[PDB]
């Protein structure tokens, strides 16, 4: 059996298992072999379920049609994205926050931008993440060589600064206790906890990055779910343009999870220690490692950013926020400490004194409802389960009655 | 002025200039500033110009409409791509070559795959490339930390094996002179030379990778332009499956340069030195660093691989092959040494005693035609210019009559 003489990338070897969501997919499949007739409801992966609004799909169809006309055909786009789309994103989301069209970089979504940013930052930076949070910041970090090995004692990669976000701290790190790193990944509203940082917290965040000379990578993918009067962009914090960039996506606003369209904003005043603008290196990465978001996806996003698009998106968002209420009420009425839900389509449920993988296995086993074990998001998620509110209304309602049956004798 | 204390990535500092194609777009823009009424003809970046066939755009439009219905909506797909699409690619382009559906990974294009492969290989591998070739291979390698600095005497980045491809050698390198590396990026039909490696030459390539325990990254971006009877896939060479992967795209086949859809094939028997299957690590990258190609672009790609889609694509390709011949005839009648254009929609024109960039500048200034300086494709490209054949027939004709007029006396 022939083998090349190329060594496996030693950063790939560092990873402890596969990406969490494939692991759940595999456990779901195993469950359906065990229970061939089970009506499985997924509240696991944060995947949108409701149709894209027609105003948006019509623009995509019209663009597809135009590609077969002489006047309408277009080929390669500027890798930064169509100017009018960059302009629409700059005005709609950062109007008055001093962001130009040219600070916006359109991508095929936030997961890809995080990895492209990690390529730009390179192997020699250190990172901080919320603990828990979205597994891609850590995993991208390991793959690029920014970490040591996984320590199975603490459930942590070496050299990553994990900032615990717990009910006892209001799901915001105690920054006086957080070590300096080059990069701070900060997601708000947070996946998985649902917690949105207040203006005073984000102010502390920017102050902390400024004294440490760090870069905040701010993930606003769920900002449109905000209910409380908290900032939706890091650039609402004066000083942020010196220490922060932001990544966003239409995945969770327009149901573009399969259509693929996000953006990153890197401000002009964000500079490396030698004065070099970070936006110039990202622009290099985006020109060399990427050939632009799909022309049809970009036509769809442009349609989102119109009175009719914004109205359609708000309505779908409103639907998921009502699902989220149904879920919150269910657990609260069952006597659980339930977190998130207010500002985010995730409910973060406290299952103390159990391993979250066990709670996950139990719920799956007995109710045929898939959830996401907290420990999939880091050692700070242990003791919790994330429940996703994306689903048709009937499925949400049915999941909740299955919860009520499962848990009626736990509480008290 | 405030600065962070994050050190700039030193691999980013290594890079000599901006990426080639943006730099050309920038000179085109300046030219239009200088002469706002210039009727500019763009034959630089190899960007397709003709409309996508209706059978293909119809499928994409249909998928968009379905996304607004209960029953037709879909969110996240497999990061590897829709199974029917992996099945269509495996059978259409590799039927009989031992390629399974699960060895195909659908991407948003070849440039993206090249960089994802490079994240996957990591910074500890050494690469070889053809010289000249498509600059993304060298630049991704620099970005990933696989290289030394740029040496301006030789015009090469340190620690890359530039395999010399010349008119004299048939643009196929003498492999006895090529040092061992981990990765060998090989493009056939090659961009910028248009040269397609024969069956015998690829056999030598596989034998060389096999003795050196190298991995071949075979880029077949232009394979559908083959006229000569040469293999279109590296997997046509027995033993390729132990040493090679392939990257391709719908960009040049269907005009998806803006729609975004390609694929990589990584065979089961491709293993690192510890025996670990390389495809398995690519799959981890693709799950961690990517969220799948656009559902609409996937539906377009699926419609391509049907009798109606293959006929329609074939017809567009033949239109650009006609364009390329017009361009060959023009330059050969002006008495230039002209290469390529047989198996590729590019012509590779020798301008002796003159820098590629000055030739680019002169053509653009005098005729308002954008071309590509050959030195953008590495040091072996110096003294050549690449001319792309993509364009409406009237624009190719006008460009050619402009060349003749400029160069005839
Ligand atoms: C905080 C955060 N950032 C980025 C993303 C991905 O955005 P896209 O690549 O634009 O669809 C998401 C989507 N997350 C879902 C989907 C899973 C995934 O994208 O890996 C989840 O955790 O269940 C996210 O929550
Ligand atoms: C040998 C080869 N491999 C990969 C690509 C990238 O194609 P896609 O990302 O699929 O559209 C290309 C496309 N090259 C163009 C476009 C510029 C670019 O992709 O950077 C050119 O050489 O003019 C290529 O020539």
Domain containing residue A336: CATH number:
3.90.1150.10
CA-based R_g, chain A, Å? 22
Cβ A252 vs Cβ A224: under 8 Å: yes
Annotate A322-338 with DSSP letters as a single string: HHHHHHHHHHHHTT--E
B387 and B376 fall within a common domain: yes
* Ligand found nearest the CA of A220: 1
Cβ neighbours of A315 (radius 10 Å)? 11
Q: Is residue A3 part of a domain?
A: no
Q: Which residues contact B28 (CB under 8 A, 6 or more apart)?
A: B40, B42, B44, B364, B370
- d(CA A115, CA B120) in angstroms, rounded, equals 12
**Final residue before a domain boundary, out of A305, A339, A364:** A305
**Pairing between strand A346-350 and A369-370?**
unpaired
**Final residue before a domain boundary, out of A252, A287, A305:** A305
Cβ B55 vs Cβ B309: under 8 Å: yes
Cβ B300 vs Cβ B60: under 8 Å: yes
**Pairing between strand B104-107 and B262-265?**
antiparallel
Cα A389 to chain centroid distance, Å, stands at 15
CATH (domain of B239): 3.40.640.10
CA A189 vs CA A61, A329, B87, B187: distances in Å:
32, 20, 40, 45
Q: Which residues contact A337 (CB under 8 A, 6 or more apart)?
A: A167, A349, A350, A352
Q: Is residue A124 part of a domain?
A: yes
What are the backbone dihedrals phi and psi of residue B378, each rounded to the nearest 5 degrees, phi first? 110, 170
- d(CA B110, CA B221) in angstroms, rounded, equals 8
A223 and A287 fall within a common domain: yes
Q: Do B242 and A4 count as a contact with CB atoms less than 8 A apart?
A: yes
Cβ neighbours of B125 (radius 10 Å)? 20
A239 and A99 fall within a common domain: yes
**What is the rounded (10 degree) CA torsion for A271, A273, A276, A281?**
-80
DSSP at B391: S
Residue A8 known to bind ligand? no
The approach used to solve this structure was: X-ray
What are the backbone dihedrals phi and psi of residue B310, each rounded to the nearest 5 degrees, phi first? -65, -35
**What is the rounded (10 degree) CA torsion for A388, A389, A391, A394?**
130
Cβ A165 vs Cβ A382: under 8 Å: no
Cβ neighbours of A32 (radius 10 Å)? 12
CA B277 vs CA A177, B245, B300: distances in Å:
42, 12, 31
- Torsion region of B340: left, alpha or beta (phi above 0 gives left; psi -120 to 50 gives alpha): left
Cβ A370 vs Cβ A44: under 8 Å: yes
The residue segments making up the domain with residue A59 are 50-305
Residues of B in contact with A102 (CB under 8 A): none
A245 and A318 fall within a common domain: no
**Final residue before a domain boundary, out of A261, A287, A305:** A305
Q: Is residue A4 part of a domain?
A: no
Q: For B255-406, list the strands marked E by DSSP.
A: 262-265, 338-340, 346-350, 369-370, 372-373, 384-388
Cβ neighbours of B26 (radius 10 Å)? 11
- d(CA A63, CA B372) in angstroms, rounded, equals 30
Q: Is residue A1 part of a domain?
A: no
Please check whether residue A47 touches B, CB under 8 A: yes
Assigned token pair, A376: 């999939």
Cβ B216 vs Cβ B209: under 8 Å: yes
**Pairing between strand A369-370 and B338-340?**
unpaired
Cβ B341 vs Cβ B324: under 8 Å: yes
- d(CA A334, CA A323) in angstroms, rounded, equals 17
A37 and A127 fall within a common domain: no
Ligand 1 atom with the shortest distance to the CA of A261: 10
- Torsion region of A281: left, alpha or beta (phi above 0 gives left; psi -120 to 50 gives alpha): alpha
Query: For residue B152, what are the β-bridge partners?
Result: none
The label of the residue with tokens 């300086």 reads B373
Cβ B382 vs Cβ B356: under 8 Å: yes
B312 and B261 fall within a common domain: no
Give the resolution in Å.
1.9
- d(CA B135, CA B22) in angstroms, rounded, equals 12
**Pairing between strand A369-370 and A41-42?**
parallel
Q: Count Cβ atoms within 10 A of the Cβ of residue A167 and give its class: 0-12 exposed, 13-18 middle, 19 or more buried.
A: middle
Q: Is residue A2 part of a domain?
A: no
- d(CA B392, CA B50) in angstroms, rounded, equals 7
**Pairing between strand A104-107 and A262-265?**
antiparallel
Cβ B396 vs Cβ B326: under 8 Å: yes
A268 and A356 fall within a common domain: no
Least Cα distance to A24 among A38, A48, A40 occurs for: A40
B111 CA distance to ligand 2 centroid (A)? 6
Q: Which residues contact A378 (CB under 8 A, 6 or more apart)?
A: A129, A131, A132, A133, A135, A138, A155, A156, A162
Please check whether residue B82 touches A, CB under 8 A: no
Assigned token pair, A401: 């009655």
CA B366 vs CA B37, B90, B108, B355, B402: distances in Å:
14, 47, 37, 16, 9
- d(CA B137, CA B376) in angstroms, rounded, equals 12
* Residue from B251, B262, B376 whose mutation best tests the ligand 2 pocket (most atoms within 8 A of CB): B251
Q: CA angle, B15 as apex, B121 and B20 as ends, to 5°?
A: 95
- d(CA B225, CA A81) in angstroms, rounded, equals 29
Three state DSSP letters for B7-70: CCCHHHHHCCCCCHHHHHHHHHHHHHHHCCCCCCEECCCCCCCCCCCHHHHHHHHHHHHHHCCC
Q: Do B2 and A121 count as a contact with CB atoms less than 8 A apart?
A: no
A22 CA distance to ligand 1 centroid (A)? 14
Q: Identify the closest residue of chain A to B12 by CA–CA distance.
A: A281
- d(CA A27, CA A147) in angstroms, rounded, equals 29
CA B390 vs CA B48, B83, B346: distances in Å:
5, 32, 8
The label of the residue with tokens 């969490």 reads A20
Least Cα distance to A144 among A159, A134, A163, A132 occurs for: A159
- d(CA B243, CA A155) in angstroms, rounded, equals 37
What's the distance, Cα to Cα, between the start and end of chain A in Å?
62
Residues of A in contact with B271 (CB under 8 A): 1-4
Cβ B63 vs Cβ A57: under 8 Å: no
B296 and B327 fall within a common domain: no
A131 and A236 fall within a common domain: yes
CA-based R_g, chain B, Å? 21
Which run of H or of E encompasses A11? helix A10-14
Query: For residue B104, what are the β-bridge partners?
Result: B265
Can the peptide bond before residue A132 be classed as cis, meaning omega within 30 degrees of 0? Answer: yes
A56 and A31 fall within a common domain: no
* Residue from B22, B25, B28, B110 whose mutation best tests the ligand 2 pocket (most atoms within 8 A of CB): B110
Q: Is residue B332 part of a domain?
A: yes
Q: Count Cβ atoms within 10 A of the Cβ of residue B277 and give its class: 0-12 exposed, 13-18 middle, 19 or more buried.
A: middle
Cα A243 to chain centroid distance, Å, stands at 20
Q: Is residue B320 part of a domain?
A: yes
- d(CA A232, CA A230) in angstroms, rounded, equals 6
CA A297 vs CA A52, A256, B96, B302: distances in Å:
12, 8, 35, 18
Annotate A112-152 with DSSP letters as a single string: HHHHHHHHHH-TT--EEEEES--HHHHHHHHHTT-S--EET
- d(CA B293, CA B105) in angstroms, rounded, equals 10
Annotate A80-106 with DSSP letters as a single string: T--HHHHHHHHHHHHTTTT--GGGEEE
Assigned token pair, B395: 């624009």
Q: Is residue B1 part of a domain?
A: no
Give the largest CA-CA distance in chain A: 70
Q: CA angle, B406 as apex, B405 and B408 as ends, to 5°?
A: 65
Number of structural domains chain A divides into: 2
B126 and B115 fall within a common domain: yes
What's the distance, Cα to Cα, between the start and end of chain B in Å?
57
Q: Identify the closest residue of chain B to A282 by CA–CA distance.
A: B12
Can the peptide bond before residue B132 be classed as cis, meaning omega within 30 degrees of 0? Answer: yes
**What is the rounded (10 degree) CA torsion for A347, A351, A355, A357?**
-40
The label of the residue with tokens 């200034």 reads B365
A396 and A407 fall within a common domain: yes
- d(CA A281, CA B300) in angstroms, rounded, equals 33
DSSP at A156: E
Q: Do A111 and B290 count as a contact with CB atoms less than 8 A apart?
A: yes
- d(CA B213, CA B179) in angstroms, rounded, equals 12
* Ligand found nearest the CA of B46: 2
**Pairing between strand B372-373 and B384-388?**
antiparallel
What are the backbone dihedrals phi and psi of residue B255, each rounded to the nearest 5 degrees, phi first? 75, 25
- d(CA A129, CA B273) in angstroms, rounded, equals 34
Q: Count Cβ atoms within 10 A of the Cβ of residue A306 and give its class: 0-12 exposed, 13-18 middle, 19 or more buried.
A: middle
Cα A121 to chain centroid distance, Å, stands at 19
């Amino acid at each position: 059996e022939y083998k090349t003489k190329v060594s496996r990338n030693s950063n790939m070897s560092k990873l402890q298992a596969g990406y969490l969501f494939p692991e759940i997919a595999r456990r779901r499949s195993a469950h359906l072999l065990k229970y061939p007739d089970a009506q499985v409801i997924s509240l696991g992966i944060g995947d949108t379920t409701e149709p894209i609004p027609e105003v948006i799909t019509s623009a995509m169809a019209k663009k597809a049609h135009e590609l077969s006309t002489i006047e309408g055909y277009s080929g390669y786009g500027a890798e930064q994205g169509a100017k009018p789309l960059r302009a629409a994103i700059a005005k709609t989301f950062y109007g008055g926050l001093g962001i130009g069209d040219d600070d916006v970089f359109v991508s095929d979504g936030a997961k890809c931008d995080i990895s492209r940013l990690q390529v730009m930052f390179g192997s020699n930076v250190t990172i901080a993440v919320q603990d828990p949070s979205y597994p891609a910041y850590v995993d991208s970090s390991v793959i690029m060589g920014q970490t040591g090995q996984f320590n199975t004692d603490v459930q942590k990669y070496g050299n990553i600064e994990y900032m615990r976000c717990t009910p006892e701290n209001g799901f915001f790190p105690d920054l006086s206790t957080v070590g300096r790193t080059d990069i701070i990944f900060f997601c708000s509203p947070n996946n998985p906890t649902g917690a949105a940082a207040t203006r005073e917290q984000l102010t502390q965040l920017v102050e902390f990055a400024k004294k440490n000379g760090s870069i905040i990578v701010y993930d606003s993918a769920y900002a449109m779910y905000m209910s409380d009067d908290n900032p939706r962009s890091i650039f609402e914090i004066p000083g942020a343009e010196e220490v922060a960039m932001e990544t966003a996506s239409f995945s969770q606003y327009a149901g573009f999870t399969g259509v693929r369209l996000g953006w990153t904003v890197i401000p002009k005043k964000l500079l490396y220690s030698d004065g070099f603008p970070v936006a110039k290196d990202f622009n290099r990465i985006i020109c060399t490692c990427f050939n632009g978001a799909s022309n049809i996806s970009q036509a769809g996003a442009l349609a989102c950013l119109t009175p009719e698009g914004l109205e359609a998106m708000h309505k779908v968002i409103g639907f998921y926020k009502e699902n989220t209420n149904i879920i919150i009420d269910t657990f609260t009425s069952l006597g659980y400490d339930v977190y998130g839900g207010k500002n985010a389509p995730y409910v973060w449920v406290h299952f103390p004194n159990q391993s979250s993988w066990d709670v996950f296995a139990e719920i799956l086993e007995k109710t045929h409802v898939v959830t996401t074990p907290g420990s999939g998001f880091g050692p700070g998620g242990e003791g919790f389960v994330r429940v996703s509110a994306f689903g048709h209304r009937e499925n949400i309602l049915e999941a909740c009655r299955r919860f009520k049956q499962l848990y009626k004798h736990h509480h008290h």
